[PDB]
Amino acid sequence: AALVVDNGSGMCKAGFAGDDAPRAVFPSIVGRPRHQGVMVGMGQKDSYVGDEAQSKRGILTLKYPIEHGIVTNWDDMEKIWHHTFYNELRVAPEEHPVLLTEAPLNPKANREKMTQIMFETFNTPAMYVAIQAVLSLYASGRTTGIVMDSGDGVTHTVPIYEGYALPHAILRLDLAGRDLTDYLMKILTERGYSFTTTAEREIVRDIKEKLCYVALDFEQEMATAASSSSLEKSYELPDGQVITIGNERFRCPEALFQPSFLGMESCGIHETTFNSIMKCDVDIRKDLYANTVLSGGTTMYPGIADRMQKEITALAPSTMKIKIIAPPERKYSVWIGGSILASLSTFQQMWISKQEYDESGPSIVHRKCF
Amino acid sequence: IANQPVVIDNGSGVIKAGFAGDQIPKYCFPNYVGRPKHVRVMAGALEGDIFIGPKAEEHRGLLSIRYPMEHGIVKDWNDMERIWQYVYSKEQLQTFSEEHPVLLTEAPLNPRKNRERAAEVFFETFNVPALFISMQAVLSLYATGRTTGVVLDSGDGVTHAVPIYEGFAMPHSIMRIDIAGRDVSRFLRLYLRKEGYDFHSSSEFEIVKAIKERACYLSINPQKDETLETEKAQYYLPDGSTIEIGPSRFRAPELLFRPDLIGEESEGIHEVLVFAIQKSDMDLRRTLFSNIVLSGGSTLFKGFGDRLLSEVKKLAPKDVKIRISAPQERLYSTWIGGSILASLDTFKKMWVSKKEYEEDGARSIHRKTF
Amino acid sequence: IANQPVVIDNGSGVIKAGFAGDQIPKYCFPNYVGRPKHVRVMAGALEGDIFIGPKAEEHRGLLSIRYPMEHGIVKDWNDMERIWQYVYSKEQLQTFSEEHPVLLTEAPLNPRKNRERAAEVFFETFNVPALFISMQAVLSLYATGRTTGVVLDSGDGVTHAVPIYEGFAMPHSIMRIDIAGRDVSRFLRLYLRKEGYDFHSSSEFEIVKAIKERACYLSINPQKDETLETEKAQYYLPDGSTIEIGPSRFRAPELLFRPDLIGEESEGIHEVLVFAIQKSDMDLRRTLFSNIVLSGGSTLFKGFGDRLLSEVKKLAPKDVKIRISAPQERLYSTWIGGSILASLDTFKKMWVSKKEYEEDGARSIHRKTF
Amino acid sequence: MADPKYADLPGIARNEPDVY
């Protein structure tokens, strides 16, 4: 009946309500070609979208519409929604209701503009905007627990206890997968593997997904890298060329735990989660320590849950029992939560309608959200 | 309609409940209504929006707690109606208000308007067959089995001393103060902020009570303890962060003896006990000195009775046998005597029936109590 | 050794210094320690690597600013020692610490450990002959010339109302809340991210303070301003890029009156002013209402004094003469009174001498301040 | 007996010694 559409900054995920996993999965990209006066043969698309842009990557200027969970170009975001509904899902938006997701502490105008596009342009019967962390917690099954959500757009934390979100203890963070990908691309240039153009941005992203892992101890990993060359793995590109890097596997995702490398002057993901828990009430800290949930693609590095356990225990008192909930399906946890929320019978009375939107306007969504 | 009557022992700190002819109250829980601070975004949360008893004790951090009674005087009448409804409801008693007669309790010399409005609640909103209101001192002596006795009690709200002699309560010898356990806990909180560790929220306030219950003692000589340097004992929170209490643990209960510390010139516990014996007649004084009974929670401090003896030795006439008695069950002494009073056959004569209340009104309730 | 004594008006936001008997403090600079983010490659650069005062204000963007003092409680003691050393150095005062006595200032109901550590710094690291710690309320009344009146103050750290009647400060009626200018500036930043124009860096944080100082106002009726739609007035940043502020300008300083917005159940300024008057004895209340003195920078919002009076009219008893007075120099109120107090001949009796500290220790400082 | 709060070793009472 209802459609769930997790508009992620990287991978735009979408499908149906009451499902195990999403059908439509693709990178939210809109590649426009090299505009030269020379002609093109047997016709082509003026602006590609999704997997088509990824396939024909070499030529196209890959521009993401969402930057840090914030929609910059709205015409680009409108084309991706259109690509999700008609091409991938093969179903009109007028029949099915549409669950959407944004990160917490976003601009207030973005929900209003997102909702305006759904009702005016797409003619949706009913829509809703949920917090990503709230859905990630709902996919995991627990009512209680903090959610250290981390995608390519935005890392953020939302502490919740017994089905009561703590909006003032929320802490949004500028560090994310895209900033890690840019950092890996820079340190690759330092060892003679220069990647400037946006076509190579996806190759270094794919290198980041495969090889990189979180260090248990950074100074120890740096010492072993200088001594031995067993850690130095090789990755072959789409092209037959193959490259080898030693230091850059553990050093790339260390930027999460040490933002000083990127030049952000912010708290690391390990202590940002701690600072979120300390901002909550003193009586409900034990359960937040016990249920330290992870979600998103930036939590898919091997050994990240072990590093979070080391750092949070180091920050917190010795008496506390720290525990990180790190499921196998944490990459697609936000969408799974939306599918379970859409499947419930209580959610049928929580939708916005066309008549309610015509009466109120875009400002009705802020009341419905939280 | 003479079913097994209910014994509701009221009080600002704790509210004891149960049936007549029992050894100990089965239903003891703290007297406050808890309502959630935060927003409930996620479904499957703690329903009701009003938390009383063990749910409120379990989920403190969510709830903005507020005490309905201050100094044995209910300020918020809607909150006490909800608590008395919760007492009767299926979560505690599992019985109707229509079946059983009610035994209510109040501190002496309280506002008569509050006693009238209490009766109005039990007769109109609840449909009670018969109500009876009684004193704390008379009930404490019922539990011990005595008739002669000065009852120095110290609850959360009120401290007072009613001198009874062979079943003759002297109303004009009653000495009362509005300085008690809550003010000592509030005074301890103020000291802890001066030490360093700040507590401000209402859920966060009950941690200070738990510190006061556990780690506090009364020094026999306070000037000697001042001149000496303390050891600074530790305490663990529900969070796990350690707190060095210091001299605030011994200086906190000095509010009971020196009420000039809070900045409110009253008599004090020891002076109230002496003044109650002095205001009574000449021949009754020596019997009243021999029978001094203790009750309430703020008599449970370490070295309380030892210091209360020494203060009586300082004030009272020389070469007189002082005996400050104090049963094992001091906290439930008032409830036990009510259960004993309810079980006796004379109880039927003392109460105010619903028919008598409908005919006369408040005047009949004022006549039957005294 | 009785030289012209130094006044050091301590504060979280701003620190003000000079000598006794002066009309206005000559040396007003912000209380923080800027340290450079970027690496210094080229020679002939800014030397020292620890920036305090006008150099730090001039070169914001280079320096990672961090405040040592939060809520009148120094966390980073090494930074405050460097600030006090910078005050005494040739860049500001051009004097030795050994010659002059010191008048330090602190907020009421602070941690006593900070007061001892403050004294240790002045007596041992600096070699001060005599030190004296005083309250902000008592000094503000010295500046005006009065003895009676409540002193409502609101700087960057603390908001506290001290009722003083004819040279008698009542310590048990001193109300305090940690909801001052810094929390308002932090709440304004969070609102500007909701508007769209996000700020994250520490040098970039002081732009929000400049926005808070310039373009903000406290409305009389907040519900009426919520129903009406704002005009979205502009403000130009130090760069040049314009910012449409919107409803974030007026709802930001509402935090001072409504502390539930940030997520911390406290009194608020208007409740603290009433509560301080109500905690005092009956006969002094009407004189305390007639004499209300404002102070600090967070009382300088547009329509603040008008809102304070409306809130006092709502809470306080009817038909009572309310009068909220203030000095012309509200920021320099506490320093001028200290300079007056220092120049008095009695000041010699009040202070803690170096010899007295070496003999007794912390006890003599706790005996002389209060 | 059953219930949360009790005091162990205070004694029932504190009494002054009886002289002749």
Ligand SMILES: Nc1ncnc2c1ncn2[C@@H]1O[C@H](COP(=O)(O)OP(=O)(O)OP(=O)(O)O)[C@@H](O)[C@H]1O
């Ligand atoms: N196996 C992996 N290891 C490390 N990083 C990964 C891995 N897979 C994906 N990523 C990173 O995470 C991103 C995947 O996005 P994700 O599935 O978290 O949803 P999203 O588009 O970030 O939306 P949201 O912000 O709602 O999570 C990629 O852009 C990539 O940089």
Ligand SMILES: Nc1ncnc2c1ncn2[C@@H]1O[C@H](COP(=O)(O)OP(=O)(O)O)[C@@H](O)[C@H]1O
């Ligand atoms: N062991 C203890 N030591 C010190 N104080 C206690 C102890 N137990 C309870 N109290 C205090 O006494 C209060 C409970 O006393 P109680 O007689 O039940 O008051 P009331 O009957 O007026 O509700 C609590 O609020 C608590 O602060």
Ligand SMILES: Nc1ncnc2c1ncn2[C@@H]1O[C@H](COP(=O)(O)OP(=O)(O)O)[C@@H](O)[C@H]1O
């Ligand atoms: N005109 C103004 N309007 C609003 N806020 C101001 C204004 N001027 C200063 N402030 C705020 O108040 C603070 C100054 O108050 P002050 O009492 O000097 O603080 P401190 O606690 O450091 O002594 C500044 O840090 C600033 O944030």
